[PDB]
Design a protein around this ligand. Structure first.
Ligand SMILES: *[C@@H]1O[C@H](CO)[C@@H](O[C@@H]2O[C@H](CO)[C@@H](O[C@@H]3O[C@H](CO)[C@@H](O)[C@H](O)[C@@H]3O)[C@H](O)[C@H]2NC(C)=O)[C@H](O)[C@H]1NC(C)=O
Ligand SMILES: *[C@@H]1O[C@H](CO)[C@@H](O[C@@H]2O[C@H](CO)[C@@H](O[C@@H]3O[C@H](CO)[C@@H](O)[C@H](O)[C@@H]3O)[C@H](O)[C@H]2NC(C)=O)[C@H](O)[C@H]1NC(C)=O
Ligand SMILES: *[C@@H]1O[C@H](CO)[C@@H](O[C@@H]2O[C@H](CO)[C@@H](O[C@@H]3O[C@H](CO)[C@@H](O)[C@H](O)[C@@H]3O)[C@H](O)[C@H]2NC(C)=O)[C@H](O)[C@H]1NC(C)=O
Ligand SMILES: *[C@@H]1O[C@H](CO)[C@@H](O[C@@H]2O[C@H](CO)[C@@H](O[C@@H]3O[C@H](CO)[C@@H](O)[C@H](O)[C@@H]3O)[C@H](O)[C@H]2NC(C)=O)[C@H](O)[C@H]1NC(C)=O
Ligand SMILES: *[C@@H]1O[C@H](CO)[C@@H](O[C@@H]2O[C@H](CO)[C@@H](O[C@@H]3O[C@H](CO)[C@@H](O)[C@H](O)[C@@H]3O)[C@H](O)[C@H]2NC(C)=O)[C@H](O)[C@H]1NC(C)=O
Ligand SMILES: *[C@@H]1O[C@H](CO)[C@@H](O[C@@H]2O[C@H](CO)[C@@H](O)[C@H](O)[C@H]2NC(C)=O)[C@H](O)[C@H]1NC(C)=O
Ligand code: CA
Ligand code: CA
Lengths: 639, 93, 639
């Protein structure tokens, strides 16, 4: 019988004798780069990962085939041109090498107005309106899809994206880069249902698809455009001195995008190590395999970590006597550059099989981007599991423990649209976690042809040790989630969350008071949820771990916690991110808070009936989660 | 089982005897049907469609004995119930 | 240790010593009639049922308090008047004593056109169009809500409902009656969320609420109206000779409905007998307590059956050593006359607690209406359980077994909107069953003031024996569902259903072929589902029944069958009846068939994109149900 200390020490022992840089550099060889989704080299790497899973002697290795629609470049070259309104002069600024997938193919001409990052606050605090004009923005703070959506919400006709040198210190000013502008995840032409032949692909377009052209440009093209623009950019933007705000009266910009749709076959590779007690429950470990360019940091690191973790855990199970109670799934996704298409379509295809069975997802994408900071974004149910992991895993350089801030949990930022763990958490209700060793700046070569092994090993000379530390974090997550009879999922954490929610409501007391509404029911639901969590902990304490059935019942009550926060009053097809805490849409608590915020700022944007329905549905979602966690239906003390 | 092997070789000899005259695909299908006392013979456009239809029939009708021969599929059953079910499936799928 | 035979014999022994007619007569005393929803006598009967549940010493007795909006009569009297279009005379046809709940308060004047029953086929085969005119219809074939919805679909401005003597041989031609016209269930002003104070009751109206006034009239008023109408009614309508079709050119009808909304408090009474092995799984047995008039057949019989079943099962557990593996819930609902409001709001309030816990609902409403036929409407999962019950329960009069037709399962009518088991099956995915000893005609006094104990005991002199037979059927259901380690839920039944579906598609093959579509994926999904059911039956056969863990896994897979047929692509708030087989809306298979039927009629009523999405979503619902039933996610085979 092995306990936690033996498993941790054996994990570290096997991590010491593992060479990550060799596998990363192998994934950067010419037979695997570049590997755009659906390409021949993407399939070659998929076959390599599949055969490696087979050589690891996993419990079962299989694959999934999807036919999804991506967007690629046309024979017609996209162009950014400057036209003089004195019809006598036109100037070709750039024929960009990169592009933004799912952009609308169109040609637009108008003024060019500079927005700082494309955020809502950047647009609102702008002197010049953007309606009817082309917008140029820097990348770095929000996804391309969010920038394009915010620009289109104000009737902008086009979006240009560039990388300034201050935020992206790249020597090559003509470097191209790639992105996508779909405000969502998965195949945008099969929204809410799997991209399988069984559906016969009916006509359906995701509502997150933009309706304006968007194109990426180099810093040199951005400076050429600034040469024809006026007005200094604000000092708090902290950008280059060449930055300008609006084009001159005589100059307009013409943007031509002609990208074309392409139906491709993508492969999702899977391996499973079956559990020893409850093999029907499992953790999922995933990593993105595809990449526009070489994708060393964006895709190679994660795939190498996946391979090494699968190999190490198979060796621990076959030779070291590691007996996980629950199963472990290792997944190599494809089409991740287009919005986690493979993982989202797998979730949409097998939701009926994953329901209350897959209880944790661990993402490995971009886990090594630097060495200064260790950042994590996860559901609160994993926070404790993260903390205990940070308290005994050492930093690859300094040698200190990762746990240095005791208030780290209050500074965790929620998962974003571009993270593969976001559809796991917000759509399927599976607790998900993403982590990375990174810097305060963004990795400058993401989505570019400079994301190679040379740049990664040069910027991070200790790449092997940092990859080993990331693999140690992931392996300790997996062991803690699969080794014991308890799941190590901390439901009590959500109590804190609920508190914050009602505290966020306090700043609007008068509004709640002027609409004839009360917050008493929210506090009563908070009390009920606290009571349910306290009695669940008490029952775990008073139960005997050898009694398989009492533990099974309590663990089922634990596994229903995240699912009960998915909004049961919303269509999963049109609003797949149903999680009221971490999703998107009018059913979430942040949307309720923003709608209530619009009532103080007395414009006509506040919708009172929508706010009343939001409050009712959120209140009963919380109360029903508390009731379900409290036990049997007849043991609910409500009156 | 070698009996299924000998039936396959019988279908091959029947194919040669059909090869001797100028026959249509349906004539060869009828010859395949009468050769091995089959219930249903379906001639697909490709081997992939043949395998797909055969797998669907085998999933819905387990007792059927299926012989895939070029793009032809031969369904042999032991009861009239399975014959009717196989015919419905092959005709409507 | 008691087995099935001992439990059957003791159940019959206790049924022999049970007096049902005395409790029926008690429920018709002046302290309990009439018991409109929310009235004082409704609360008195609720308190009586609660005290009976306590005196039976059930495991726990509790109650639920709801505040729902019903519609009642106003001080202003609803009126049906005849006006001469010359303007020279007006004639009060009737000031009806009854009314239709949830009717819109309005006054409309126009022609009166007779529709046979208000069905869509009745409207299509009509000489005179009904747009802009008032429609008069007979009750009996569909709910009032369906009649009003069909009338509104053709722009009718009003609906009159009467009881002809041929369909309702009532001597009193001036008898009033009551109904409701809400196309749905539950509180129509809290669509999709519980009617609790926690929601603070936001403004939201169910889409099933009609927008035209509808009123019930007596047969004497109908004949007075026919006196001013022309045209003989068709012979196949099989109605009275006084029937006429359209008003004369000189006569119009003025209908005035002024019903008012009223917020009332309703009580749901509950008792629970806890199981001895798996008390967290349970069967629910319910009965309607409220009634407009005395409601002897509509409410008294069901409530008496509920009381007697609770008493007998409590005695069997406490004195006869009956040890049910699972729990049994007895529920007395209120506001059932307004569309199963109590049961629907209980389901919407505790859906999170009932999920995969409540595995069967048994309705007791209107179980004794006659003696000729024994009719049943249930989910296919219960069909086998019904068959085995019909093969050993004897008819109360003839003494023969109820099982006389071996092809009964192919003639079962699906649950309808007015049945309390319909929201259990179509909304929450709980297998539900309703049954009755009835006649070929409808019980004529339902919804009238003549639904008294005298009329019931006069029409059915063997009332005690028939009530005993109904209670025996229900008790055998409960015993079979709770006594053994196996659930007696027949998943294989659904195979038959799927066959019917594709057969119903065959008559449109040509359409499917000219749209470039195929039915091959549906047949492959049928094969997958059939093989999954076969594998599950084989696993049940090879399993050891004393091994609680293997049985637990297989029974959980069984309990997920009905839930996986709920459409996962539709909003449960706007389309609560998500069951693709037994629900309502464009996500159901019957809706797909009707849309496909419209393609033959070459006018633009056929919607091709809607049909393609319907086919895709139904195909993947079936395929995902098969995949979930087949086992673990890695054990799913894909061509
Ligand atoms: C961005 O939006 C602004 C405001 O909507 C646009 O400026 C406005 O353009 C309209 C033209 O449709 C002007 O309306 C005209 O006003 C004059 C004088 O009042 C009137 O005689 C005309 O009949 C017509 O209604 C409007 O004055 C002008 N300014 C404002 C403050 O509204 C601007 O054109 C948009 N940018 C684009 C389209 O690139
Ligand atoms: C499942 O759906 C996919 C997606 O449509 C099907 O793959 C596609 O099949 C079509 C056949 O109509 C292929 O078109 C062919 O293209 C090749 C060259 O690309 C050409 O030589 C042929 O003449 C024909 O035009 C299409 O390429 C193919 N798509 C991909 C990405 O491979 C697939 O056939 C469907 N499977 C089943 C069993 O129905
Ligand atoms: C029920 O629907 C019918 C059809 O819309 C209504 O009858 C229609 O009434 C309008 C005006 O009363 C008619 O418009 C006229 O149509 C003639 C057709 O030759 C045209 O020449 C005139 O210029 C004028 O547009 C319309 O034709 C007529 N339709 C028929 C078939 O007679 C009827 O009023 C509706 N019922 C009620 C109670 O409103
Ligand atoms: C839960 O919600 C129900 C329904 O909204 C509340 O019951 C209702 O409460 C109001 C205000 O207390 C009652 O109106 C009052 O009636 C009295 C008597 O005529 C009058 O003096 C007042 O001026 C006012 O009009 C209303 O009757 C009552 N409805 C029913 C059906 O009882 C209930 O108070 C809420 N409970 C909680 C704890 O918030
Ligand atoms: C045939 O059926 C299709 C499918 O239901 C209908 O297309 C649907 O049309 C409606 C309204 O034009 C669209 O509603 C949209 O909903 C989104 C939800 O976010 C909203 O943003 C839009 O403003 C709009 O209200 C719906 O998307 C669309 N669905 C599809 C699949 O195209 C079509 O109208 C029907 N045809 C006829 C003649 O009734
Ligand atoms: C305020 O919010 C309500 C609720 O979402 C909106 O009401 C919708 O109105 C549209 C048509 O305008 C209908 O199709 C929907 O059915 C309504 N929704 C509901 C839930 O009833 C309303 O439009 C919003 N008001 C504004 C000014 O945007
Ligand atoms: Ca989808
Ligand atoms: Ca409700």
């Amino acid at each position: 019988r092995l306990y936690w200390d033996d498993l941790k020490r054996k994990l570290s022992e096997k991590l010491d004798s593992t060479d990550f840089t060799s596998t990363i550099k192998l994934l950067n060889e010419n037979s695997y780069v570049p590997r755009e989704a659906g390409s021949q080299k993407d399939e070659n790497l998929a076959l390599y990962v599949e055969n490696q899973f087979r050589e690891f002697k996993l419990s079962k290795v299989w694959r999934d085939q999807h036919f999804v629609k991506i967007q690629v470049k046309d024979s017609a070259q996209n162009s950014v041109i400057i036209v003089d309104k004195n019809g006598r002069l036109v100037y070709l600024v750039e024929n960009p090498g990169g592009y933004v997938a799912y952009s609308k193919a169109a040609t637009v001409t108008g003024k060019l107005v500079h927005a700082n990052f494309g955020t809502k606050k950047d647009f609102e605090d702008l002197y010049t309106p953007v309606n009817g004009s082309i917008v140029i923005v820097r990348a770095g703070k929000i996804t391309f899809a969010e920038k394009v959506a915010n620009a289109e919400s104000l009737n902008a006709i086009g979006v240009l994206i560039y990388m300034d040198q201050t935020k992206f210190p790249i020597v090559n000013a003509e470097l191209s880069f790639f992105g996508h502008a779909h405000l969502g995840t998965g195949d945008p032409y099969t929204p809410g249902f799997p991209s399988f032949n069984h559906t016969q692909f009916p006509p359906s377009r995701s509502s997150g698809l933009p309706n304006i052209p968007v194109q990426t440009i180099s810093r040199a093209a951005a400076e050429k455009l600034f040469g024809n623009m006026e007005g200094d950019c604000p000092s708090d933007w902290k950008t280059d001195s060449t930055c300008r705000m609006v084009t001159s009266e005589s100059k307009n910009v013409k943007l031509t995008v002609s990208n074309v749709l392409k139906e491709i076959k993508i492969l999702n590779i899977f391996g499973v190590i079956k559990g020893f007690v409850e093999p029907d429950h499992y953790v999922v470990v995933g990593a993105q395999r595809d990449a526009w360019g070489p994708g060393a940091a964006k895709s190679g690191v994660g795939t190498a970590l996946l391979l090494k973790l699968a190999q190490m855990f198979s060796d621990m199970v076959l030779k070291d006597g590691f007996q996980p109670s629950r199963s472990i799934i290792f997944a190599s996704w494809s089409a991740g550059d287009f919005g986690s298409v493979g993982a989202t379509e797998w979730l949409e295809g097998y939701l009926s099989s994953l329901h209350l069975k897959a209880f944790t997802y661990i993402n490995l994408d971009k886990a090594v981007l630097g060495t200064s900071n260790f950042k994590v974004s996860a559901s609160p149910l994993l926070y404790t599991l993260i903390e205990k992991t940070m308290q005994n895993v050492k930093h690859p350089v300094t040698g200190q423990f990762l746990y240095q801030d005791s208030n780290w949990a209050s500074k965790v930022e929620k998962l974003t649209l571009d993270n593969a763990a976001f559809p796991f958490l917000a759509y399927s209700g599976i607790p998900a976690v993403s982590f990375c060793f990174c810097e305060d700046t963004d990795y400058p070569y993401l989505g570019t042809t400079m994301d190679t092994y040379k740049e990664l090993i040069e910027r991070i000379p200790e790449l092997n040790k940092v990859a080993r530390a990331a693999a140690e974090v992931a392996g300790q997550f997996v062991i803690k989630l699969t080794h014991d009879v308890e799941l190590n999922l901390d439901y009590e954490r959500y109590n804190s969350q609920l508190l914050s929610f009602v505290r966020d409501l306090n700043q609007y007391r008068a509004d709640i008071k002027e609409m004839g509404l009360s917050l008493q029911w929210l506090y009563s639901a908070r009390g009920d949820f606290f009571r349910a969590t306290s009695r669940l902990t008490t029952d775990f304490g008073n139960a005997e771990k050898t009694d398989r059935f009492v533990m099974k019942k309590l663990n089922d009550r634990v596994m229903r916690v995240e699912y009960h926060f998915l909004s049961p009053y919303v269509s999963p097809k049109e609003s797949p991110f149903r999680h009221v805490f971490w999703g998107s849409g009018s059913h979430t608590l942040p949307a309720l808070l923003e709608n209530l915020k619009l009532r103080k700022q007395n414009n006509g944007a506040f919708n009172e009936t929508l706010f009343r329905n939001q409050l009712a549905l959120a209140t009963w979602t919380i109360q029903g989660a508390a009731n379900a966690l409290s036990g049997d239906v007849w043991d609910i003390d409500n009156e | 089982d070698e009996r299924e092997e000998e039936q396959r070789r019988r279908l091959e000899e029947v194919k040669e005897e059909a090869k001797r005259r100028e026959r249509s695909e349906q004539d060869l299908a009828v010859l395949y049907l009468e050769a091995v006392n089959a219930a249903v013979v379906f001639v697909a456009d490709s081997e992939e469609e043949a395998k797909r239809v055969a797998d669907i029939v085998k999933k819905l009708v387990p007792e059927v004995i299926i012989f895939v021969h070029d793009n032809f599929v031969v369904f042999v059953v032991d009861s009239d119930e399975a014959a009717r079910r196989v015919y419905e499936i092959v005709e409507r799928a």
